[model samples]
Target chain A: PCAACKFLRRKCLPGCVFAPYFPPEEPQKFANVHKVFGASNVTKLLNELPPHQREDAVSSLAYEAEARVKDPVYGCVGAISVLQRQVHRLQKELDAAHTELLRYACG
Target chain B: APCAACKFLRRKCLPGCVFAPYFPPEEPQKFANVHKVFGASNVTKLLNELPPHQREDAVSSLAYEAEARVKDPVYGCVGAISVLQRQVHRLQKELDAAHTELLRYACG
Candidate 1:
């Protein structure tokens, strides 16, 4: 049985969509996704997509789900915002360093 | 009196509609983009599952991601993060070089 089926207390059918991606060892993988997006919703989502794209979609959903658990208010968007702020700060620091370098080189 | 979500979905917005609080009638495009990306059914399930306190922020994040996805189908909001990460890396390198050069000038 896949982790999703194991967690959901159901039999892992022969054509279980989750069996391939969600193995038995990684129970928490499906748990987190189930908590955030719900099993039904994720199942519907996975069913709607083609087989090739489902893996990427699962990974993305899991990433966002984990982030949402860590930071309920912003989720993955918080990470994006933090990175943006870091870039802005680094730009300012780089500008200052350039100005200092020019002052020293000129004098 | 339909909210943006209901108006876009062409359904009657009940008093207890899940999207009413976050997606008001004024901002039709907000729900439109989100609906296009995530779908009304999925969004409805998500909002209904979340606690009321968190639902608004969740909607905001979903809307942001939906728009980003529309702009860049492949990477979405992740593309923005990757660009910012590269910018930070480049800036750090440049700043280190500038500081090293400044130190050399000061020492001489």
Candidate 2:
């Protein structure tokens, strides 16, 4: 008996996919997904997919929804960009540290 | 000494734009690939998002990732990072081996 069902004024039947994931307590889950991908599209997507895949799909939608809300410009790519930057920066530091050690040894 | 900005922008790359020192016309493709992927305007916007000191790093990151993307379409920087990570691991092991060899010499 989630808000989605309540809002739609429909019954939350047994084994409802939305029931377990998007509980009545967290209306915001569906709200976030609705805001990003829309409720109708999500329903369509879930309806098309098998039961096992639906969980992953819903999770991905929510994750992206949160990210998009936080950063409309880059979304997931922004996090990827920041992470790659850190890795590059650290690699340079490690290379320099190794070079300095080798130089001291040669001297 | 035309600046990288001028070369990329298709303009004269003016006398005193801040992009002069770091970007050289020698490696024309350096900015080319980055501009292709990120677009010049987008890079300019990203540059403006940061402070002057941090901007250089941002530029370097763009260039680096752009090159990575050119080399590997799907993996991009992850591919480069994976290679570097492997190299670092290999080197760290070699360093230990050298250290162990030195210990053997001392013991002998």
Candidate 3:
């Protein structure tokens, strides 16, 4: 509800937050979680949840352990909002984000 | 050792073979054998193996089943060379191939 802080785009200090699950990209790196779920696909699933069930679905599947770089103290609700925004931004920028992952799956 | 077909890019017919493993992607699609072992990283790891331990390591963990879309009749030997070349091409083409798993992890 802190509209002012949000509008300013200033650091939230304790309110700092980031996406919950940003996929486990091994890219051959050790940091990769090696899991099938990635943040991009998960966010899209959230977006497709008919809005009525959005928040609940995300909370239940809270997997953004790697993307959770922020320190938001307001709890997961804030994190959910942050993920929504981050994913929104990513989808918008990547151009490929909105498309189905199948397009590039086997071919 | 069939150099006639040499480097000519064409179907391998009975010699057909494909990469043994292509890491399955969760792109929200569940093909069938979505496992991880011969993933991209595996190929890269082979390339970086100091040349001495390359082939042994390559055969040790064969996984590109999906990308292995061919009917090669060789005892995985043809598949091995195919994977070796395919990976070589990928690494060469992407430029970022050998650099690392695309640390584009994010803009720190």
Candidate 4:
């Protein structure tokens, strides 16, 4: 049985959509994904996407789920906000630096 | 008297309470989220590990991260980082163009 079916305590039928991406060996991955997004939502999301895209989508969701479990409040967004702040700070510095360089170029 | 952290934790605020300075009673949710995410003990230890000058910024960071996580359980802060990194890459290209333009003027 695939990890998703096993974790959900359902039979893994031959046509199970989760079988391809969620192997039994990595139960924690599906568990985390389930905890954050819920199994029903993830199943619906997977069904909505094309088969080729589902793998990447699941991978992304799994990563986000793991981050959420580790950081209940920030999840992956905390890292995102930190990077955003860095970009803001860099933009300010870049403007000042460019202005200083223009003086040298014009002079 | 009790600060927000102490009030939220249901305890008296001591003079040396680490959260007293950064978490004012006026903003209860700030410390509440930080406490929920990082736990008060961990925050206290982290604050104690840093110098007095650095503690405020650390608390601010913790609070920001905590709130982001609460609002976005799945993607949280990571989605913001992805977009910001794209912006940084675009800015880098613009800066390169500026440098090239400056070089042309410098050689003339």
Pick the lDDT winner. Answer: 1
Q: Pick the candidate with the highest DockQ.
A: 1
Q: Mark the regions of model 2 whose C-alpha exceeds 4 Å error after superposition.
A: A47-50, A103-107, B1-108
The Cα RMSD of model 4 versus the native structure comes to: 7.9
Tens-digit lDDT string for candidate 4 (A1-107):
99999988899999898899899999889998776656766776677667787777687778777886786544566666677777787788679768967788677
| Candidate 2 local lDDT, residue B9 | 82
RMSD after CA superposition, every candidate: 3.3, 11.2, 26.0, 7.9
lDDT of each: 0.79, 0.64, 0.31, 0.75
Q: Chain B TM-score of model 2, please?
A: 0.66
Question: DockQ (Cα-based) per candidate?
Answer: 0.36, 0.06, 0.01, 0.16
lDDT of 3 by residue, B10-98 (tens): 32423432222221122211122111212333333533442533433333323222223122211112333434446545444444332
lDDT of 1 at A54: 76
> Runs in model 4 with CA error above 4 Å?
B1-80, B89-108
- The best candidate in terms of TM-score: 1
The digit string of per-residue lDDT tens for model 2 on A1-107 reads 97667656789999765776687877767776666556665676577667776666576667655664575444444666666565666666656666656665575
How big is the positional error of residue B12 in model 2, measured in Å on the Cα after superposition?
40
- Estimate the TM-score of every prediction: 0.78, 0.45, 0.20, 0.55
Query: Which pairs clash inside model 1?
Result: none
